[PDB]
Structures are given as C-alpha cells and as structure tokens.
C-alpha cells in the first residue's frame, strides 16, 4: 500500500513568481465553439504524484441560456467540480464529485476525500466521499447555514482535519474541526479563545503537530482569526492575529486599530477568505500572506510575508513581497497549496479573479496561481484578458 | 488475477441523502456549444474501483436534427453507451458498446459484461459481451419483444445472474434468469410461483445465498413481483409484494386492494421500473424502495424502507423515508446498484428524470443518485434545471 | 516482456449477429457541435486488450469548409487516423499516425505496426512506423501507384505479414509480401500463380502455418484472387476462387461464367475490397465472406459461409447467411478482423457505409461490426440514420 | 526506478521522409465546430515511451475574438502547452504547463523539465518546472529580453542541458548552457569563442561527450553560430559555420561571403531558428540542416546533410538532399528531436509553417514532421490546406 502523506520540509526559495494562469473564459465567445463551466470558489489540492483544481459550478456553461441565478450562492444544482491541474475545466473535461454549495477536498497520500455541504439553509449537511464512495455526514448545529472551507483539508498520517462552520453570516459562527479517517469522522474538535466568528479557513502545516489557519469573520472585525491546532492532542484555540496589516477586506487604514491584539475594532461588516501558506525551514517558519490592494474593494492582490514571531501577538506590519495582481484586476478569493516535489514541499498561492458584470450577465473566475520559486523579487502580475462583451 | 467480487455487509448508515445530479442537458442549449446524447433508460453499475453510468442513447444529440423517432423505443439505431459516473454523457466522452434497445451491464471482479438486445421484435437477441469480445446470444421464446433489466446484472464468485423476459405487454410475459459466466450462459432458470407478469426487474444481493428483484407487471397489478433466487441451487420463485404501500405506477391508494396478498385488485394497465436496494447487516436486513408521488402519473418520488419480515406475506405500509424529486419534476424509472467502498458496500438509489415535450421535440433524461450516508433524516430533493425550449 | 501473439482457435458460435454501428455523421448537423472527421477505408485490427478503428482521413470534419477534395482517393492531406473501437472518430478523440493515402496497421502482442503509403503515384513509397517510432520504407517497383491493404495485417510469433501491389488500375499489379518483424522489412515475398492482378487483399490465419486472403482484382475478372502463404517457407501462390458465388462487384449473374476455374470470364472492370474472416476449429475451418447485394452498384452486403474445401477447385456456390446491409443501404468497402477473448479468437465482419452526395458536397463513412455470436440465424441488418442534407 | 536516458547510435536509414502533419486549423472554420488554440515556434520533444508536441499559445482560439495581439510575442497571456504527438492541439486537448513567452521542454528517461520564460523584458525570468513542481529560476543578466531556446533540451544521465541569452537583438547577446538536475541548476557555464550573438539555439547530442547546435546571429551575420559543448568538462566554445551554403535567413548568394570562416560578412539583420539533428553511426556522424528557399523570405523549406569534417572549418557547401516545403507555402522556424525506438534513435526535423495574414486576423502555425527512414531520396513535400478567410 502506498505510505501515508505528511508534511516535509519546503524547498528551497526565498521568493515566489507568477506560474500559472486557468481563464476558461478566454474561450467563451459567443463565436467561439468552448465549453468553459461557470463556476467560483476555486481552490487546488495536490496529492504526490497530481494536482486538481476544484471549484463550485453552477452546472452552466458559457455561451448557454442559464446565466440567471450564476451570481446566487446556494441552490439545487451547484456542484464540486475538478480537472488536472492544467486543463481548461469544460464540460467535458470535468468531473462531477457531488451536488455542494460549499466544498473542500484533499489526498491522504492513497485516496481522495470530497467534502461538500448542501441542504437548505437551516439544516444543511456536511457530505464525506473517500474515492468513488459515500462514506460520512454532519449535521447542522447552528442551523444558520453550515458551511466550510473553499480550499484543501490537511492530511497527515492518514488523518485529514477539516474546518465547518454555523452561524449567522452577521454574527456568532463558531467554528469546529473535524478529524476524519478514510471518509469517516472519528472526532470533532470544539476550539477554545476568540470563537464569536470563524469562517472560510485557509489552514496549513506549520508543523508535525501544529495547523495553522487564517480565517474571516465577517461581523466583527478587519483583523483575522487565526488558530493553532495540535494535532497530537486534537485542542485547538484561537485569537485574532495582531499584524497592523489587516487581512481582511473590508478594513481600514493599516494600525488604525487601536488597543492591544485582542481588540476587534469597527465592524466593517463583511470579508473574504484569504491566502496563507506555510515555508518551514529546519530553524525558521516563513508565513506567506495574501490582500487585495484596494481596502473597500475585491481588486488587487498583495503578498506579503513574516518569519517566525506569534501571528497572536505580533503588532509588526508584514513585509510586502509583491504585487500578484494590479487594482485594475479582481482580487477576489485566495487560498494556499504545497506541491508536493520528489523531496520538499512547494507552497504556493493560489487567486481567485471573478469576471462580475451584475446580475443580469454570467459570473464566474479565472484562477491565478504563484509559487515559492528561486531568488530574487516577484517580477510579474496577472491579468485575465477576459471581455466580458464577447 | 483480481479475486471475484461478492456482496459484503453495507457501510455504517441510517439514511440516504442527495448525492450527485448528472444532468446533460443543461448543456444543450441552441446557444451552447456542446453535445449531450439522447438517451433514456440510464443505470449505474460499478466495479470495484470505478462506477460506470450506462444508457440506451438514440444516436442523436441536443442541438441537432434528429429528434424525430427519439420517443419511438425500439430502433436499429439505439445503442448501449456508457461514461464514467460523475463525466456528462456527451458524444465523445461516451463509449459505444452494442447496438441494443434493451440493456443491463455488470462487473465480476475481473472484467466487464456488457448485455443488449436488439432484433426484430417477434424474434429478438440477447447479445453478451465480455470486456472487448462478443462471447454468447440468447434467443426469444415466447417470440414478443424479448427484453431485459435497465439495471445492473448481479455477480458472485464469477457467476452472474439477469433476468430476461419475452411476451406481451398486455398478457403474460414469463421471465426466465441467466446463469453467465465470464461470458458464456452456463445455464438457464425458470423461476415457480406466480410467474404470469415479470419484467424490469431491479435485483440484488439480500445474502451470500439470495438475490431478491423487485419488478414490474404490466398487466395485471400494481402490486410488484417480487423474486427471491437462491443461487446455492439455482431456483427461483415469485410472490407478490404483500405491502399496503403499492409500489407500481399507476396504482389505486394505499392498501384499497382487499383480500389476500396474493389478489392482484383490478389491472390497472401499466407499470415503471421501480428502484430497489439491499442493507445488509449482520443481524437484520434493510429493504429500501422508491415510487412517484403521483400514483397516476410519472412525477415526484419517494424513499421508503422495511427492515426484516416477509414482503410475500407483510401487509404493513412501508416507511416513508424522504421526498427525493417533488411532484412538479418527472420522476420516471429508478434503480438500485452499491457503490464498493473499501470494507464494506454502500447502497444507492438512482432515479430517471426524463424531459417530456411531446412527440415533435427530443426526448432525453438526467439522472439523480441518493446513496445511504450518515444518520438523520433525508434533507434535499433534486430539480434538473433545464428549460426544453432553450 | 508480453509474449508474442499467435492465432488460436475461433469462439464456439455458428451465426455472425450485428454487434456494434460507428455513425459519426449523426452528429454532423449543421446545427450541432460536433466534429466528425471525413473518412474512407476503415478497418479494425485488435491486440489482446483493446480494438482500433482505424481510416484515412482527408483532415476536414463536418460541418466544415474543405468538402471540395474529398472524394478524391491521394492528395497530400490524406493520413491514417485511429480512436479506440467504441468511440466516434473526433477531431479531438482521433490519434494522428502519419499521412498516408493507403494505410494498414495490427499488432504482435507487444506493440503496433502503422503501415502507410504516400509519396507521388510513379514514385510512392511505404513507410512503416513502430509504435511511436518511424522505423522503415518500402520503394515503388512498378512506378503504379504503390499501395496496400486497407486492413489489419497479420502477425505471428512477430512477425507480420503484409500485402502491397503496384501497377495499373486496368492491367497488370503484380502484388509482394513484406515479412516484418519490430518494424523493419526481414524478407521480401513474390507469389507464384495467377499473378497478372492482385490488390486490396483481406488476409487472415487459416491455422499456424497458412494466411489465406481474398483478394481484388480490379480488370480482368469479377472471379476474387486467393492467396495461399505458408509462414512456415515463406512462399505465396495465387489462384482465382472458383465458386459460382462471385464476390466481386461489379459482377455477372451467379456461375455465369463458363470455363474451369482458372477462366477469368469478361472483364468487368473494377472491384471492391471485400470481406473475408475465418472460423478455425479442431477439425474444420469456416470461411465466411461478403459481398454487394447489388451486382453492379455498392448497395447491401451479403454474408455467406463455406466449411472446408478448396476455394481454388471447389465451383460450389457459397451458402447464403444473411442480409447485413438491406439494397437501399450503401455497401461498400468491407473487411474481416479478430477479436482476443480470454482463450479463443472472435472472428468479425466490418462493413463501410459511404454517405455518397456527389462531388459538391462531402463524401464520409459509417462502419458496421458482425461477429460470430452463438447459433441460430442472422437477425438484423444495419442503416446509417444519416440525412445528407442536415 | 527507470534508468536515465543517454544518447544511442541513431536507427539504420540513409534519407528522411515525409512523416506526419499537424495542421489544427484545417478545424477553426467559422463553420465548424472545433477550437484550434493559437500557438506559434512549436517543437517536440521525446521521452522513452511518448513525443509531446509542445508551444506557447496566445490563450486564444479560432474562431474566437482574441485575435487582436496575436502577433505580439511577448505578453502576460502566453502560456506553454503540450499535447502528445498526434493530438491536434485543442483549447481541451492541452495541457497548460506554465506562463511564458519562450520556452524549452525535455525528459531525463525518469520526468519532464518544463522551461519557461516571463516577466519584464528588462528582467525577465527563466523558470524551471520538474513534473509538476515548480523547482527553480534563472535572472536576466543583460537585463534585455533574457529567452531561450524554441526546441528541446538535452538530457544525459540526468543532467539537461539548456540554452539562455540575453542582450539586443540588434547588439550583443552572449548566451550561457545552464546544467539542470532534476529540476534545479547545478551549473552555469559561459562559452568561448565567437560570442557577439548567439540566439535560439537548436542542440543535440553527437556523442556522450558533446553536444552541438546550430545558433542564430539576429545581427552580425547569415552564417549560423555553432556551438560544442563538452559534457565532461561542462566547457562550451563557439566558432561560426564555415559552409557556402549560408543556413540563416536573410541571406546571401552562398559562397558570397569573402574571407575565412570566421568572416560575418553583410548584418543582413534578422535571423530564423534553424533545423539541425545528428545521425550517429559508429564510425560517421550525419548533420542534417534545414533552410528556407527563399534567401530572403519565410517560405519553403530545404533538406541538406554532410557527413563528418568539422563545421567550423570546412567552407565546402552542404548536399542538398529534398524540398520537405515549396517556395508556395510558409517555412518558418525548424527544430529537431530523436524519437526513441526499442535499440535506437530515430532522428527528425520539424517544421513550422505560419499562416500569416497581417495584423488584422489571427496568426498561427502548423507542423510538419521529417524523419530519416529508409534509403533513396526524399519523395514528398507538406502543404497546410488552410484557407484563412474560412
Ligand atoms: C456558504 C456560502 O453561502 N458562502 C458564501 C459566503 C458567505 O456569505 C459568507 O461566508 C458569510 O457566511 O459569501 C461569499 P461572498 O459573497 O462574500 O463572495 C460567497 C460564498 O458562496
Ligand atoms: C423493451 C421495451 O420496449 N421497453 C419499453 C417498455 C415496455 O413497453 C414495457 O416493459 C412493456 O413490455 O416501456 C417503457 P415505458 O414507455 O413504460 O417508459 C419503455 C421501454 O423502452
Ligand atoms: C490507393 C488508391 O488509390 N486506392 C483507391 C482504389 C484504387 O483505384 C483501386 O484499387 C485500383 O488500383 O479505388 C478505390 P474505389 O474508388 O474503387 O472506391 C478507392 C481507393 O482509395
Ligand atoms: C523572446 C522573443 O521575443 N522571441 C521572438 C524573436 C526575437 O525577436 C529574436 O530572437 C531577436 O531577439 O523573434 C521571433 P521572429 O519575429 O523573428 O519570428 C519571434 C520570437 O517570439
Ligand atoms: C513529519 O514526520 C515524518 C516521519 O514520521 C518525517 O519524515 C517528516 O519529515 C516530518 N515533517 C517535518 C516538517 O519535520
Ligand atoms: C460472502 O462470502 C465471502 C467469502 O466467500 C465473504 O468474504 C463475504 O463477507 C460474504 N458476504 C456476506 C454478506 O456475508
Ligand atoms: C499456434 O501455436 C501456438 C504455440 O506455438 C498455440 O498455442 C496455438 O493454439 C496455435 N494455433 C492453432 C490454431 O492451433
Ligand atoms: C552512451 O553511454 C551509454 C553507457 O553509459 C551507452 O549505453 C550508449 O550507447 C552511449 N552512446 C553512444 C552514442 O555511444
Ligand atoms: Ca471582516
Ligand atoms: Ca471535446
Ligand atoms: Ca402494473
Ligand atoms: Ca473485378
Ligand atoms: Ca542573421
């Protein structure tokens, strides 16, 4: 049987560059003869020897007669959806994994595992897939829309720990995690700390016995939510990471958030998942951050970094390592991803780029995605090149 | 070589929810640009790494011109065609089997069998093919339409079991089981008891030692046949299903057949292919079913369930389980067939959701799995989504 | 490494049943999204785990634009193109082997020997390519056309046998055979016997030390060359067939021809490829053959059998099968090919099906399969459900 | 694991032949059906078991509405992608390995070595992918267009070696060999000799100990750079070709360039990527080159070899040896590869054949493929059949 999967050290880099770029749209000419799937939420999950790119699709395509609807986030036909990572996801080329509005998926180094919830909105469910089959639920506890992820679940020793949340989007989401083995939940884990509201985490080793997440609140705060789980004990905590460069956005002016770590600040109702991914080094720890440059609005995309300290009580601002994508582009969701190479891991940022022209049109996204690579300083952006006219 | 399949105990679970949508035509719009085919009578069967989607398409698909005749079910042009479950059934990414107007596939372990029956109607052809050669036929005995399943075959140790029939829609049709073995019929069984009406059967593994088929007559009840096929001697009997809870379509209401089990009540001309499927345990055993929510008509479906007893000799209403499909969707043939998950078999139910306009458009069918998976009750019912005059 | 391949003994079975249509122009409208190529002269050749359609295409599909041409037989266009036998040939799911306007391919068990021509008519030249590598080349001996089989070639213990001719369409083509072993040309074979006209031969394995093909002669009689090659010595002879059942079209009236068997009888200038397939038992050997319903056009085809005897002597008339293609449907090319069951050879009859709609317009293939399949008689024959004009 | 991959003696063959053509626009008709990508300098390279057809595409497809910058050739939209030889290069048949505007592919016997170049012209990135990690990059040195090679890279025991220039396309561009291991570089190595200008170099193997390829001088010369490189010392020198016969295009009359072999004569500004392949006997070594008709123009395409003698040294014109293209179809830029047969390699040309049509519509590129196979002379030339106003 092939061996488990467990996190190794990154390889070497001190730098990350532009990669690679999936804009199924480009093909999506009313005069063109493409099949490019509507969908957002990308994210990408690799195993040893591959990588897929998932998404939710609202099971249309462009050109097609069902644009009305492509802009609402839960219904009755979104789909998790993937392709190898490289190939346009169309119609054809892609797999249907199962009927989610919300999703989530990762390799333990011998079988896939698709997560997606879906159910109407006060009882919503929590769905387990190991391969071909059907192997676990979970139910609703909040009964205000369960929910998860948007990005890869995190393996070790065949152990995938996986974040679910419930709650009102405007106010308490606590948040669980849930430790599953070979499709099956073998516990749930109640975080301790800062838990009002935790959603959408982008989580990481940081360690053999450490994950680490970056998290949105979408009620009270600009600052996000960071949590520490040990894997050995299964406990997790969280506080709210302590950086004058706010993650989230909305947000307001960098520091302007006055009081120790703890303090949530104004409201500024709303946010987005973030990109966070880890660099472990055999002496230090590089954290890999990712925000759109406009504060108000989902266009550009930042990458920042800091080595070692505590994301808890850290105030410093991050170092800003480059401009992945200009305010004049979508910068709308983000994620992490390691690839695994013969002997390191190679973590990597993956971007979420949505072609929005209001509700009376299609809306969908390409996906932008920057890797750990050499030396040196980020040399380019990415655009989609995308009209939305055609 | 791989060891022959055989029926194990199911995975742990007290429910089914929704599962997976594969709806083609959502992508067949004048507007789009892809090629979903026609088809009708789909089934799943799977392997032990890999489920296969199989249907009986019209060598036609939306958009195109050929839409004339896809009502009309028996053709020289129908043909068996299969995709890899979770891939949309398009003109390329289909197989093309056999020529056939009447099919049924399963897997032994080892390798595939194909079944298909085509020929004129007074003296029709089963055909057998065994992965890539064509190894047996079977000819018609009762010279009316000889035909078969529309679901998966059933093997164990190697040897696997079908049901065929032969005679008048409106009168007797005797059904017969072939015993095939890596793709020659080994041998043939006439089943006893009540045997004027049985087709479409929809069987599985109760046991090690019982194959139990739900099935449709035509003629003279909407109460269903029921098959119990011992495959240690090779016998098979037929009783009809004892419940209250009728599961043919059209059918009067519930338990309004007065007498004994065995009175069939009044004609009630007609029937539907009706899902059915096994949930061994090692104490007790779970018998799931699935009917229209309108006793007249071909729209909605419903899950049900019995644990244990006698379906020849229990009158008692089934459990009423959940509402997969509302009665505002078709809700046509269904099916039964288990996903092999690692250690243990995980049932589901398949259900055929056929897009009726009339004789002077096409006439095609999405498909909807709902898999037994977790505890709780059944959440979400499933829409196709497609709008026929796009 | 895998073993070699070697001809075994056929399948039980006493009757060839319709088994499978490839239609690609049923999804050729004008209105759909498809992409069918534009072929001539298929054929299958097997290997022990999977079949191939292959075909000499004219690298256009329909709908399209460069219909003018391809009704013409060589041009530099033309190449040998192959899908898995099952699916429709694609400009997508098409494999592209090398350009060639005459083409033949089989398979030693181990890898796949492509056999094209092209070049100019007085000067053409053979190539052949070994799996992916393009390993050697046959010159033009009669500065006629050089050209080949239009079917599967035959290896044993790896070595193949193939047959190329040369020379006038209406007078003399002196055919060779080429011994080729992992790619290159080991020995070079010249026929003895009635020698003035041979081309287009279907050969197959009457046992392990003889191949036997049916042959075209396309001036000097409607009487079929025969081949006689004993692998053992490496030595051909050739003789006309002298049943009163010709198999050539155009033809004259059964046994019309007077004379012994040698008597070529009037030119009937012109021919067909036709098909030819054998059925090898312990003690007998079956030849079964096809042929045109229609004398003088490429309508229907015919399926006829003869056990044993000597095609060279025996005046006999062949015994009528079966009606595999009806008058009103196109019968044009046809050949024969085995498929590798687990422990016994499956002996199968191919049939082209030429949308033919003049010069203006395009000028495509349908291919319908017969196999050997069980006993009885042969039950139905096989249409295109193609409408030129959509 | 497989063993590295090294360099054999070359397959017996005296001449090249026309193999195959890959000409995905026959299927971009407004018309059809199909999506021909958009690619341009196309090469292929070989692993032991499969050829890939690799090219950087515009991410755009005919018909389609990107055509506008399609003759741009640096952008933030390039991207390189791959099909395996034989697959027409479809918007779903590709593989998008990476962003870039230049780029280089080979296989060590063990993974594929994706090279791609991006960024800013005046720091542009070489980036070095290994299956499907991101390994390692390369900084601009000259700070002016830092590019590489169009062709592919050279393996020896697992060792690849790659050719990057930078520097003015009208000045100075001093190349450099970067030594690559299993996707990270071990080694940079600065050449000797005749520096000034060396460009878009086509390299291979004439031995285990040296590597030569064939260059172009976009400024000082139409006579080509030639490079030899030892393997053992990691040591490169470069001297220009002493042939009459002039490989670069433009060009002068050949012989006309007075003076030694060291002599750049005329500018004649502006250059072409040259064809060039060894055929390795165990006592001669084959150079086969390719070279437009036109002195001036990118039109036809013409076969020469000469046997032994040292490049650098010999003035004595190259024999030519066939017209692969006439002076009536594009000849643009030509490359060579080995295709690896069972005990020997299988030298080949490629050829790319542009269909320009101005700044105004879209520009794209067939493939034509030569590969020594058999004797006698060179029969048959390539033509692309595509009309561009279709
Ligand atoms: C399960 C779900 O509905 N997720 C949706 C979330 C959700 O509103 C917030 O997490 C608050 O709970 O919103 C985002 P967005 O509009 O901010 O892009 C789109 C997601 O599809
Ligand atoms: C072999 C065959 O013809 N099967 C057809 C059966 C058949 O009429 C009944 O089983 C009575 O024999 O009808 C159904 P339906 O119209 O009820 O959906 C469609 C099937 O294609
Ligand atoms: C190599 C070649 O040209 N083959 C062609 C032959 C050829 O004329 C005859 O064998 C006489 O040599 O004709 C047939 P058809 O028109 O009879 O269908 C079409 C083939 O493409
Ligand atoms: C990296 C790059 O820009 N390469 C381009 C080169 C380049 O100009 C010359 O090598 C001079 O440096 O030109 C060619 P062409 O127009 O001659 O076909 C097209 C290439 O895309
Ligand atoms: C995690 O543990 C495994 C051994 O159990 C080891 O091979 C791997 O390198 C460890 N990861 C890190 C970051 O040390
Ligand atoms: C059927 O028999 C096999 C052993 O022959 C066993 O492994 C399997 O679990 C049995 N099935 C059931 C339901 O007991
Ligand atoms: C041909 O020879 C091989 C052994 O060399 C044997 O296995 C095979 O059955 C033979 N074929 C026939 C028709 O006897
Ligand atoms: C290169 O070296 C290997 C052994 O190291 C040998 O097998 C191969 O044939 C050599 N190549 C040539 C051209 O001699
Ligand atoms: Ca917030
Ligand atoms: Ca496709
Ligand atoms: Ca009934
Ligand atoms: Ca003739
Ligand atoms: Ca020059």
């Known amino acids: 049987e092939p061996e488990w999967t467990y996190p190794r050290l990154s390889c070497q880099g001190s730098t990350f560059q532009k990669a690679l770029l999936i804009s ?128 890869a679940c995190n393996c070790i020793g065949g152990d995938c720990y996986l974040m679910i949340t419930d709650g009102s989007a405007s106010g308490i989401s606590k948040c669980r995690f849930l430790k599953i083995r070979e499709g099956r939940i073998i516990k749930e884990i109640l975080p301790t700390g800062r838990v009002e509201h935790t959603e959408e985490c982008t989580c990481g080793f940081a360690s053999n016995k450490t994950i680490e997440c970056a998290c949105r609140d979408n009620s009270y705060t600009a600052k996000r939510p960071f949590v520490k789980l040990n894997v050995e004990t299964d406990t997790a905590e969280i506080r709210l990471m302590c950086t004058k460069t706010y993650l989230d956005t909305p947000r307001p002016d960098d520091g302007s958030i006055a009081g120790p770590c703890e303090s949530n600040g104004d409201k500024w109702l709303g946010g987005i998942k973030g990109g966070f991914v880890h660099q472990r080094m055999a002496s230090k720890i590089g954290r890999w951050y990712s925000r759109t440059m406009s504060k108000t609005n989902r266009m550009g995309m930042e990458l920042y970094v800091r080595y070692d300290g505590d994301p808890w009580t850290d105030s410093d601002a991050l170092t800003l390592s480059g401009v992945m994508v200009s305010i004049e582009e979508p910068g709308w969701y983000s994620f992490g991803f390691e690839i695994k190479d013969k002997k390191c891991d190679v973590p990597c940022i993956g971007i979420e780029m949505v072609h929005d022209g209001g509700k009376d049109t299609w809306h969908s996204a390409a996906t932008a995605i920057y890797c750990l690579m050499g030396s040196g300083q980020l040399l380019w952006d990415t655009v989609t090149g995308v009209d939305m006219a055609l």
């Open 24 to 151: 199924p749209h480009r093909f999506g000419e009313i005069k063109g003869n493409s099949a490019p799937l509507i969908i957002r939420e990308p994210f990408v999950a690799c195993g040893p020897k591959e990588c897929r790119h998932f998404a939710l699709t609202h099971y249309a395509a462009q050109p097609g007669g069902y644009y009305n609807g492509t802009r609402k986030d839960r219904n009755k036909l979104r789909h998790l959806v993937s392709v190898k990572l490289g190939k346009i996801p169309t119609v054809e080329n892609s797999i249907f994994h199962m009927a989610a509005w919300s999703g989530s998926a990762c390799h333990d180094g011998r079988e896939w595992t698709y997560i997606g919830v879906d159910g109407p909105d006060n009882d919503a469910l929590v769905k387990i897939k190991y391969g071909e089959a059907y192997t676990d639920t979970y139910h609703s506890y909040a009964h205000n829309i369960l929910r998860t992820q948007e990005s």
